[PDB]
Every structure is written in structure tokens, then in C-alpha cells.
Amino acid sequence: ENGYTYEDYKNTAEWLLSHTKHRPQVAIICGSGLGGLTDKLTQAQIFDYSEIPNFPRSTVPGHAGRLVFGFLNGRACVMMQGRFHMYEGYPLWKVTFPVRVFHLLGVDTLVVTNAAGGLNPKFEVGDIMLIRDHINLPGFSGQNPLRGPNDERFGDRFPAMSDAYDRTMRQRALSTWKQMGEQRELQEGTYVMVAGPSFETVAECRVLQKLGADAVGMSTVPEVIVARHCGLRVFGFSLITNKVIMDYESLEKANHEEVLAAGKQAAQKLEQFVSILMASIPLPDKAS
Amino acid sequence: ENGYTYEDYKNTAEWLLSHTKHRPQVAIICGSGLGGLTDKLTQAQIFDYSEIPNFPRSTVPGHAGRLVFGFLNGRACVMMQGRFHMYEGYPLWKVTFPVRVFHLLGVDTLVVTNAAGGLNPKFEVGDIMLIRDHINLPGFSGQNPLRGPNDERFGDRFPAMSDAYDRTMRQRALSTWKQMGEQRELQEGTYVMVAGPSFETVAECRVLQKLGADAVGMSTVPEVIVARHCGLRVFGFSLITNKVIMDYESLEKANHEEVLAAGKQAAQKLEQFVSILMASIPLPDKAS
Amino acid sequence: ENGYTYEDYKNTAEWLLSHTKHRPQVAIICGSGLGGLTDKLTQAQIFDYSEIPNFPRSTVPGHAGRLVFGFLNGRACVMMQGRFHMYEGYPLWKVTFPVRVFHLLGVDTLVVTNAAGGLNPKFEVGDIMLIRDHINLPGFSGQNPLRGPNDERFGDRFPAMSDAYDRTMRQRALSTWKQMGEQRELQEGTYVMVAGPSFETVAECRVLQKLGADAVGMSTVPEVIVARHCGLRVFGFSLITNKVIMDYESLEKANHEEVLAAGKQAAQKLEQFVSILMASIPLPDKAS
Numbered sequence: 050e051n052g053y054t055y056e057d058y059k060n061t062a063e064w065l066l067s068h069t070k071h072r073p074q075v076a077i078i079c080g081s082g083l084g085g086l087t088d089k090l091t092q093a094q095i096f097d098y099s100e101i102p103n104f105p106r107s108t109v110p111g112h113a114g115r116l117v118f119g120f121l122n123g124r125a126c127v128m129m130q131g132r133f134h135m136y137e138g139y140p141l142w143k144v145t146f147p148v149r150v151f152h153l154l155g156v157d158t159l160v161v162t163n164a165a166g167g168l169n170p171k172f173e174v175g176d177i178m179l180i181r182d183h184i185n186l187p188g189f190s191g192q193n194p195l196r197g198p199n200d201e202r203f204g205d206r207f208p209a210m211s212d213a214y215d216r217t218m219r220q221r222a223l224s225t226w227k228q229m230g231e232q233r234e235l236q237e238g239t240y241v242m243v244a245g246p247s248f249e250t251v252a253e254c255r256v257l258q259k260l261g262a263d264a265v266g267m268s269t270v271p272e273v274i275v276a277r278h279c280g281l282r283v284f285g286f287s288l289i290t291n292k293v294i295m296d297y298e299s300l301e302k303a304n305h306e307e308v309l310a311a312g313k314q315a316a317q318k319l320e321q322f323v324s325i326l327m328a329s330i331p332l333p334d335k336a337s
Numbered sequence: 338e339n340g341y342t343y344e345d346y347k348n349t350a351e352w353l354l355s356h357t358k359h360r361p362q363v364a365i366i367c368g369s370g371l372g373g374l375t376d377k378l379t380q381a382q383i384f385d386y387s388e389i390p391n392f393p394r395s396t397v398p399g400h401a402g403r404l405v406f407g408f409l410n411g412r413a414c415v416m417m418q419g420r421f422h423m424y425e426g427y428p429l430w431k432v433t434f435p436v437r438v439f440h441l442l443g444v445d446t447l448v449v450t451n452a453a454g455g456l457n458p459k460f461e462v463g464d465i466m467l468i469r470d471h472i473n474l475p476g477f478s479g480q481n482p483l484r485g486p487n488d489e490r491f492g493d494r495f496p497a498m499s500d501a502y503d504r505t506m507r508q509r510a511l512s513t514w515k516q517m518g519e520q521r522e523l524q525e526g527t528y529v530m531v532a533g534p535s536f537e538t539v540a541e542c543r544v545l546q547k548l549g550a551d552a553v554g555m556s557t558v559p560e561v562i563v564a565r566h567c568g569l570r571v572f573g574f575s576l577i578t579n580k581v582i583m584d585y586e587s588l589e590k591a592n593h594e595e596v597l598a599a600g601k602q603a604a605q606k607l608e609q610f611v612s613i614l615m616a617s618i619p620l621p622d623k624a625s
Numbered sequence: 626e627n628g629y630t631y632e633d634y635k636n637t638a639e640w641l642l643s644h645t646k647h648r649p650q651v652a653i654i655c656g657s658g659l660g661g662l663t664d665k666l667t668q669a670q671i672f673d674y675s676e677i678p679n680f681p682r683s684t685v686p687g688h689a690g691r692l693v694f695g696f697l698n699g700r701a702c703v704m705m706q707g708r709f710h711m712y713e714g715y716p717l718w719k720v721t722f723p724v725r726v727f728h729l730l731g732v733d734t735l736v737v738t739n740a741a742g743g744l745n746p747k748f749e750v751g752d753i754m755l756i757r758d759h760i761n762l763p764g765f766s767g768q769n770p771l772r773g774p775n776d777e778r779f780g781d782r783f784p785a786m787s788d789a790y791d792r793t794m795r796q797r798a799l800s801t802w803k804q805m806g807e808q809r810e811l812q813e814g815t816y817v818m819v820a821g822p823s824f825e826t827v828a829e830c831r832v833l834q835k836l837g838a839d840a841v842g843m844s845t846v847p848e849v850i851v852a853r854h855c856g857l858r859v860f861g862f863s864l865i866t867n868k869v870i871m872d873y874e875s876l877e878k879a880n881h882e883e884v885l886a887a888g889k890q891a892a893q894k895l896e897q898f899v900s901i902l903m904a905s906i907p908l909p910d911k912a913s
């Protein structure tokens with residue numbers, strides 16, 4: 050939708066195909082800090098967005114923004130290190146351009162990760178929250194990636210989202226966590242997207258808690274939306290990098306320029322979590 | 338406001354006038370599926386949007402999108418078959434362009450219909466919900482049809498909406514329903530507009546229920562807003578085409594590509610409901 | 626961010642500097658009706674937006690829209706009479722352009738006033754509500770002034786807002802109110818921004834009350850956001866000009882074209898409130 054035409058996607062995917070011998074099945078999208086997951090791929094083939102045809106280039110930050118094709122624990126992946134966000138200024142049709150390319154590349158599963166602040170008090174920074182559902186606040190106002198004329202070549206005008214985050218994949222991630230003897234249980238909740246780059250205020254934090262969100266972030270939802278729109282199996286998770294402040298006594302103050310949590314404890318715990326899951330993603334071959 | 342100037346409206350309305358001998362009093366806007374209401378007009382004069390001067394043409398769908406001037410049960414109408422929506426990509430000033438044209442055509446009443454999913458559990462698919470009020474979610478973020486410099490020739494900078502849906506008309510619709518011996522009572526609630534084309538997720542569904550909405554749709558509100566802004570008496574209703582899924586056990590999944598409900602039971606029940614109401618719309622002549 | 630470059634701000638501020646001998650410390654932004662506060666400045670030097678370089682000109686209303694440099698109770702001010710709003714059509718980067726200019730002018734404190742309707746029932750029209758916090762509804766959808774690439778020359782990509790409204794300034798405003806023997810206590814609450822020019826509907830009014838807002842307005846928040854983003858000490862207040870209607874029995878109807886409240890009782894009570902506070906704003910010299 051908008052700005053890009055089917056041809057564009059078709060050309061980016063083809064150029065990609067004719068530039069890598071890897072035919073990816075699973076596309077992983079690395080959220081803030083969770084980028085080194087690319088390091089553990091094998092037969093890795095790296096493309097910086099910039100060199101790829103119709104691919105949105107990353108803003109100012111020339112310290113990342115690449116598409117790494119590889120193999121992770123048996124699965125042929127394609128990892129987008131450094132996602133695009135609304136705050137950077139991108140129209141959602143750009144933010145989610147890669148998700149449609151992945152589809153044309155043959156990807157049938159998209160696992161999206163992100164760093165989210167925590168609204169549910171049981172969460173603790175470092176916790177990993179499996180996304181059971183989302184609340185797409187921007188989409189309410191009209192900030193939806195599917196806006197504009199619908200290309201029946203990708204999907205429906207009115208795709209359903211009640212079933213976004215794969216019920217099976219979630220089942221497995223939970224088990225996989227247990228069979229890792231973790232102690233701190235895999236959390237499960239609802240991720241709420243908020244666009245603006247600034248961080249929540251206590252009042253905002255409280256409306257989000259009342260609305261039913263468990264984690265608040267500034268990404269993922271547009272991708273999940275267009276993935277599901279074109280059929281991709283979606284599974285994703287949030288890394289609780291910080292308890293959002295719900296009291297005026299606050300004292301503490303939200304900081305991103307502290308993308309620690311993610312690179313800290315998480316860095317490993319999560320990238321290994323992701324690897325074993327590759328095993329749990331059904332092979333397009335499977336059968337028995 | 339924006340994109341169109343007073344002249345534009347003035348010209349479209351005039352060209353219309355000088356192209357139909359009908360001087361409409363009531364303008365009806367047919368929501369999804371509820372379009373055949375046009376079939377029951379008499380002295381019908383059809384104009385496909387396309388042939389009308391500054392009239393937003395419908396997107397891809399070349400299977401409808403027309404303005405039918407006629408007489409319905411004594412009233413001289415003008416029905417817009419196939420409304421415009423945000424999801425199609427239209428700026429709200431286009432979505433609502435026809436409402437201002439209607440005003441310049443002499444229309445003093447606008448009855449808007451739509452197909453809405455149901456958040457209130459007492460509703461049943463097929464139920465007709467009289468709109469007692471709305472929650473304009475997009476307008477909160479800035480997606481308001483009145484945005485931009487205000488033309489005092491149409492109305493106020495800051496029009497009030499506490500009184501949108503005519504209190505009288507509602508009274509009458511209720512009575513009219515009774516004097517039709519219906520059994521299933523005319524429901525009454527608050528319609529919440531959500532823009533994006535995709536359907537709600539369970540979490541989204543739950544925030545809407547908590548927010549106070551009874552039905553959720555993707556239209557009507559911009560029209561009501563600009564109608565009321567220029568003085569039009571507004572009365573409208575929702576056809577509950579589906580109970581939105583509020584549980585994760587879901588199983589069922591929202592489908593539009595099932596615009597059945599509307600064409601089913603509703604098709605008639607509602608178009609006849611609309612006809613008797615023409616009688617209840619006060620004549621610009623009336624007096625006693 | 627967007628539309629304007631650092632140079633632009635730098636040039637507007639410089640031209641300003643080289644056109645006034647006043648080096649302002651406190652920048653006050655006058656909300657609807659609260660504009661005559663400019664009248665009480667001394668050594669007043671007036672610039673109508675229009676004559677200032679990259680300064681957004683006011684829309685149609687040629688009956689105000691000026692920047693008045695002066696001295697108020699000892700402090701060297703710069704008052705923006707007539708703020709810019711989203712409803713007028715301005716992109717937030719324009720609405721908030723002056724806030725960045727103020728920063729480059731040397732301003733270290735921004736006090737924003739506005740006229741807000743009241744959702745909390747304890748409030749009474751005429752009441753002054755100190756803003757303890759805000760809920761930036763537009764920013765949720767993406768309507769954030771910081772959107773677009775972040776200029777590290779002004780601030781952070783992800784500034785925090787949990788601490789927006791200065792805790793000290795609030796303490797003082799309260800005391801200052803007491804030492805004015807007012808009787809009707811200075812209220813304190815959360816201001817919720819709503820963009821659209823139209824007024825709330827009862828359902829909308831109720832979701833705002835449920836969301837936790839105390840007052841609803843159509844300004845201030847973008848300014849507070851970019852002020853805080855570039856470090857300005859922010860303190861602001863709402864003048865409850867009208868109890869927003871929370872019942873369907875309504876009868877009454879919201880009117881702006883009744884900017885009375887503000888010019889009435891408030892006109893004075895508030896502008897004198899503002900003057901004594903100048904005394905309470907710490908001098909960039911201070912020390913003991």
C-alpha cells in the first residue's frame with residue numbers, strides 16, 4: 050500500500066533472491082539492543098539496507114541497519130537488524146516495506162522482537178514477555194499500514210487481527226522456556242504501541258495500564274499487521290527493559306540512552322531462546 | 338476545509354442542481370450492504386460520483402459509488418450509495434465533501450447508516466442500533482474533518498457535538514419501530530469510529546468496550562461532524578453485522594468478506610424502517 | 626524537527642536578538658483570552674509574528690498573533706500572545722517552532738497557559754488548575770512534535786516526560802496562591818490534549834474522565850513536549866472556562882464563541898497570579 054506498488058516489492062524481493070543463495074523461511078526482526086542475534090547465524094550473508102533496491106535507508110544512524118541472511122539452528126533465516134519506527138519519520142508503508150519483501154522471498158514466519166517498558170507490575174526489567182496480543186493505538190487514529198487501496202495480491206481489504214500472534218508458536222515458546230530450566234517464567238501479555246519518540250508521562254502510563262496493556266513500545270505492531278495481512282505466521286516478544294513509572298513520587302526517570310537491559314542479561318538469554326525456537330518452527334516440508 | 342474551497346462546493350452543488358430537477362431535503366448515506374435502499378426511491382435520478390464535478394471518485398471498486406436523487410415515502414431524497422472511508426486513503430476533507438454539497442443543495446437532514454460490529458453483548462448480529470452518540474477516536478489524534486482554517490460560511494471554528502444525533506428524530510425512530518410490531522427492540526448506544534481497515538484484536542475490542550462504545554465502525558463520524566458543523570439535522574443507525582470477539586478462546590474470526598448480515602435480514606427490515614421515517618422528518622413547510 | 630532545520634531556528638533567534646535589546650529569561654505562552662497579560666509588561670517591545678523571519682504566521686485572524694518582549698515583575702519576559710493550534714492546520718513542528726526559538730534566545734523557563742474545559746466535577750468555571758501532568762492523546766497516534774530525525778543540538782531522541790511540569794515551580798505557585806488570600810484553592814490536575822476543533826461529545830467527555838484527565842484542551846502539550854526536550858523548565862496552568870457536559874440530559878451546549886470566562890473573572894486574577902510568580906522563578910544568577 051501507498052508509495053510502493055506491487056512491482057516495487059516484487060523487484061526488491063527478486064533482486065534479493067538473485068543476490069543470495071539463501072531462500073529464507075523465517076524472518077526475524079531484531080528490536081532495540083537485541084541485534085547481535087545476527088552474530089549467531091551461520092553461512093551469514095549481510096546486505097546493508099542501502100544497497101538493496103527499494104529498501105528504506107536508516108536515518109542518521111550509520112552505526113547499523115542491515116539485512117542478514119543465514120541459518121540459525123537449522124532454519125534458513127533473514128534477520129533485519131535495526132527496524133524502522135514511526136518516530137524516525139517513516140510513513141508506516143515504509144516501516145513495513147520489509148515485511149512484504151519477506152513474504153515475496155518465501156518467508157512464512159515472522160518473529161518480531163522489541164524492547165518494551167513494563168506497565169504490568171509483575172514484570173521485572175529483564176523479563177521476556179511473549180506477545181499474546183496488541184493494542185494498536187496509532188491504527189485507531191488512522192495510522193495503519195494497510196491504509197490506502199488494498200492489493201488483493203497480498204491480502205484482504207479488511208484482514209482480521211484477533212488471531213495475530215500464533216497460538217501454536219506461543220504454546221511452544223512456553224515449553225521451550227521450561228526446557229531451558231529458567232526459574233524466571235516467560236511472561237505473557239498485551240503490547241501497546243505508542244508512536245511518538247518521547248517517553249510516557251505518569252498519566253499516560255496510567256491510561257495504558259487501565260487500557261489493558263502489559264508492555265508499551267514504539268514498534269512491532271505495524272509489522273505484525275502487514276505480516277498477518279499477507280498470511281505470515283507471526284510470533285514475537287518484548288524484553289521488559291524498564292518498569293514505566295506509575296507514581297508521581299517517581300524520582301527515577303525513563304531513559305533509552307540506557308539500552309543496557311537489552312545488551313545486559315537479555316543479550317544472551319534471549320538470543321539462545323530464539324535459536325531453540327527455530328527447531329519449533331514447522332518446516333514447510335514437515336509431514337509427520 | 339482543506340483541499341476544497343467554498344467555490345468548489347458551491348460549483349458541485351450548482352452543477353448538481355442544474356442537472357436534476359429534484360431539490361433534496363433529506364440526504365441518506367448508505368453504509369456497507371445497506372445500499373439497495375436506493376432501489377426503493379421513485380422518480381430516481383442516478384449520478385455516478387465520477388460524472389459529478391469535484392466529487393471524490395470511488396477507489397478501485399467500479400461496482401458502485403453513485404448519488405441517487407429521488408423521492409422516498411413522500412420526502413425528496415438524495416442517497417449516496419457507497420460512502421468514502423479513511424481506510425481507502427481519502428483525507429477526511431474528501432470523505433465528507435458530499436456532506437457539504439448536500440447542505441448547499443438544501444438538505445436539512447442527514448441520516449447516516451453503517452454496518453458496525455457489536456461490543457455491547459446485549460446486541461445480536463442483525464440488531465439495529467440507533468446512534469445516541471459517538472466517540473471520535475481519530476479526531477482525538479487530529480483526524481478531524483474540520484481541521485484547517487474554518488469557513489464561517491459553513492459554520493463555527495469550534496462547533497459543539499454534545500447534541501449531534503437529533504434528540505427528536507431518535508424519539509420518533511423508537512416509536513416508528515414499535516408501530517411496526519418488531520419484537521426485537523431498536524437498540525440504542527454509542528458508536529466508536531476506528532479508522533484502520535484491519536479488524537479489532539481482542540485487546541482492542543476490550544479497550545473499546547471499556548471506553549464506553551456499543552458498536553465500532555470505520556465511518557459515519559466524519560460525516561456527522563461536518564453535517565452538524567453546517568447545521569444539518571443528523572440521525573443515523575448502525576446495523577450490528579457481527580459480535581466483535583472479546584475472548585481469547587475466540588475460535589471465530591472477524592470477516593467483512595461476509596457482508597451478509599447487511600444484505601440478509603437487514604436488507605429489508607432496515608430499508609422499510611428508513612421509509613416510514615421519511616414521514617417523521619419534519620417538512621421544511623410543516624406548520625401545525 | 627521536520628520542515629525547519631537548526632539553521633532556521635538559529636536565524637530566527639538571532640534576528641530576534643539583533644532586534645530587541647531584551648534577552649528574555651522566561652517565555653510565557655498566553656492561552657485563549659489570557660492574552661492581555663502582555664498589557665502589564667514594562668519596556669514592552671512588540672513584534673507581530675509576520676515580521677519575524679521563519680515565524681509561522683497566524684491563520685485568518687488578523688486580530689492578534691504577536692511576540693511581546695518585556696519585563697514583568699522583575700523578570701525579563703517574552704510573551705507569545707496567541708498560540709498556534711493543531712486545529713488551525715499547522716503541523717506540530719510549526720505549532721512548537723517558537724518554543725525552540727525561545728530556547729535559542731536564552732529562555733530557561735516556559736510557562737504555558739490555556740483555557741480548558743473541566744472534566745473533574747470539583748472544578749468550577751473560573752477555577753485555575755495547575756498542570757501537574759498531561760496525557761498527550763495525539764502523540765499516541767504519532768502526532769508528536771519530536772517526530773522525525775532528532776537533532777542532538779536541541780536534545781535527545783527519546784526525551785522523558787514523567788518530569789515535565791516542574792515540581793518546584795508547582796510548589797511555589799501553590800504557596801503564592803495562599804499568600805494572595807484567595808479562598809478558592811488553586812486546583813491541580815492532568816490536562817488532556819484533544820486536537821480536533823470541534824468540542825467533545827458526552828461519550829467522548831466520559832472516556833476522557835475515565836482516562837484520568839481533569840481538564841481537556843487543544844493545546845499546550847506539543848509546546849511542553851519540545852520545551853522539555855530542549856531542557857526548558859516548564860510550568861503551566863489551565864483556566865477552567867467551562868464544565869464539559871457529562872450527561873445526556875445536557876441541555877447546555879459547549880461554546881467557545883463565549884471566550885468570556887477567560888476575559889471575565891480570570892483576566893485579572895490570573896494575570897496578577899502570573900506576575901507574583903515571576904518573583905518565584907529562580908534567577909539564572911540567584912546563588913543564596
Ligand SMILES: Nc1nc2c(ncn2[C@@H]2O[C@H](CO)C[C@H]2O)c(=O)[nH]1
Nearest residue numbers: 081164165166265266267268293305
Ligand atoms: N514508549 C516506550 N517505548 C519504550 C520503553 N522502553 C523501551 N521502549 C522502546 O525502546 C526504544 C526507546 O528506548 C523504542 C521503544 O520501542 C518505554 O518505557 N516506553
Ligand SMILES: Nc1nc2c(ncn2[C@@H]2O[C@H](CO)C[C@H]2O)c(=O)[nH]1
Nearest residue numbers: 369452453454553554555556581593
Ligand atoms: N472496525 C470494525 N468495522 C466493522 C466491524 N463490523 C463491520 N464493520 C464495518 O464494515 C466494514 C468492514 O467490513 C467497514 C466498517 O465500517 C467490526 O467488527 N469492526
Ligand SMILES: Nc1nc2c(ncn2[C@@H]2O[C@H](CO)C[C@H]2O)c(=O)[nH]1
Nearest residue numbers: 657740741742841842843844869881
Ligand atoms: N477540547 C476542548 N477545548 C476547550 C474546552 N474549553 C476550552 N477549550 C479551549 O478553548 C478553545 C476552544 O474554545 C481551544 C481549546 O484549547 C473544552 O471544553 N474542550
